[PDB]
């Protein structure tokens, strides 16, 4: 069972941020959904939550700028954050309290993977994907993109996990992000090697073959 989060990724100051958290699978549980955010390099902050009876709770700071709601027909929970500034940049997480409590943080047994939000004036830009060609090393260079996340790098469409290291992105002196994903493989691998890269804010979906 997965909590699938969706949102725009890169937003400009003063806009309304709209996030969704969709329960992807049936659960016979009367569960509650809580929203939490984590600014870069900081800790977890409660935004608010919604109980099994739809009782909606808000943190003192969010009471005047957040609306939380549920659309039961889609099992989709919504968070709206109004008049954002750069200080609302953070990874936003949705989590489930199996007891149905809308104001509790001690028992969040199931989390979404987080949706990254960057509030900024700068323009969205999709990445170029370049092979890093040759035990042996290989990988892909995702270069010149904004904003940082949501960005996804998988290998062989998930089949290759062992030895893979996808590095944190660095802000280049150009002002755009760059990152590399690498995998160490058997020195005499011939085997098809695909890196799958998705930069959702730019609608960029590239599969790239890394050949000798």
């Amino acid at each position: 069972v997965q909590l699938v989060e969706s949102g725009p990724g890169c937003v400009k100051p003063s806009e309304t941020l709209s996030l969704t958290c969709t329960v992807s699978r049936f659960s016979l549980i009367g569960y509650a959904i809580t929203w939490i955010r984590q600014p870069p390099g900081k800790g977890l902050e409660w935004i608010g939550g919604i109980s099994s009876a739809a009782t909606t709770f808000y943190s003192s700071w969010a009471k005047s700028r957040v609306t939380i709601s549920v659309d039961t027909s889609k099992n989709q929970f919504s968070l709206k954050l109004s008049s954002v500034t750069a200080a609302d940049t953070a990874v936003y997480y949705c989590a489930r309290d199996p007891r149905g409590y809308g104001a509790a943080l001690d028992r969040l047994d199931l989390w979404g993977q987080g949706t990254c939000v960057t509030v900024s004036s700068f323009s969205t830009k999709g990445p170029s994907v370049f092979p890093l060609a040759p035990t042996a090393c290989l990988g892909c260079l995702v270069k010149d993109y904004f904003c940082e996340c949501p960005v996804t790098v998988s290998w062989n469409s998930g089949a290759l996990t062992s030895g893979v290291h996808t590095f944190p992105a660095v802000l280049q002196s150009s002002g755009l992000y760059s990152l590399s994903s690498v995998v160490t493989v058997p020195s005499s691998s011939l085997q098809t090697y695909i890196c799958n890269v998705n930069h959702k804010p730019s609608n960029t979906k590239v599969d790239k073959k890394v050949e000798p």
Binding site: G43, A103, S128, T135, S180
Partner: protein, 214 residues
């Protein structure tokens, strides 16, 4: 106000017992105290709820204790896969008084491990545009301190490279590091040997990996 956690960060060796404390001002309501583990790039994960009950599948090396306003998370046999930031979280009533602690980082010390080094020239596709990236990779070293130096035709470079480092590996506690040298196509094409020299305490002398363009 976030509950208080102590220490802010700690390190120990594999197999060691470590303790993290959590302290609140108000007493917890009905044992609502839980502990989360957050690995790099990942959502937090519930390890312990209602003060001392382990989530299914969490190894028995984790245990939680305490009451009222003072709580402890113990890891009794520290493992590489325990590298993470740990957060306590508490409820003090049923109407919105609930918060997280500030977090505690756990690092794991292990023996010295020298990096293996790989170098990548710019791809032809990237050379089609006006830019050229050269990538030096350092795999599976410990500790984190590492000097990567770029040389082009034996001329040292400064200001055109950036690096980034993974977090401690779940299986062997090592780091891995990428360093990217950025040049224009024009400057790239004027030169022949591209080298990155790696200095690390696991190597008795610096290791240089290099290629000749073409």
């Amino acid at each position: 106000i976030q509950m208080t956690q102590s220490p802010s960060s700690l390190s120990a060796s594999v197999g060691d017992r470590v303790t993290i404390t959590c302290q609140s001002i108000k007493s917890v309501y009905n044992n609502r105290l839980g502990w989360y583990q957050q690995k790099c790039g990942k959502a937090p994960k519930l390890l312990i709820y209602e003060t001392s009950i382990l989530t299914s599948g969490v190894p028995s090396r984790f245990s939680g204790s305490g009451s009222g306003t003072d709580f402890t998370l113990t890891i009794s046999s520290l493992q590489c896969e325990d590298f993470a930031t740990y957060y306590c979280a508490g409820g003090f009533d049923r109407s919105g008084d609930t918060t997280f602690g500030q977090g505690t980082k756990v690092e794991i010390k292990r023996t010295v491990a020298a990096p293996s080094v790989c170098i990548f020239p710019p791809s032809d596709e990237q050379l089609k545009s006006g830019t050229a990236s050269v990538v030096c990779l350092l795999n599976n070293f410990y500790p984190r301190e590492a000097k990567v130096q770029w040389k082009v035709d034996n001329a040292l470079q400064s200001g055109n490279s950036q690096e980034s480092v993974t977090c401690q590996d779940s299986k062997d506690c090592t780091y891995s590091l990428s360093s990217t040298l950025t040049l224009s196509k024009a400057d790239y094409e004027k030169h022949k040997v591209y080298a990155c020299e790696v200095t690390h305490q696991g190597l008795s002398s610096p290791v240089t990996k290099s290629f000749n363009r073409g």
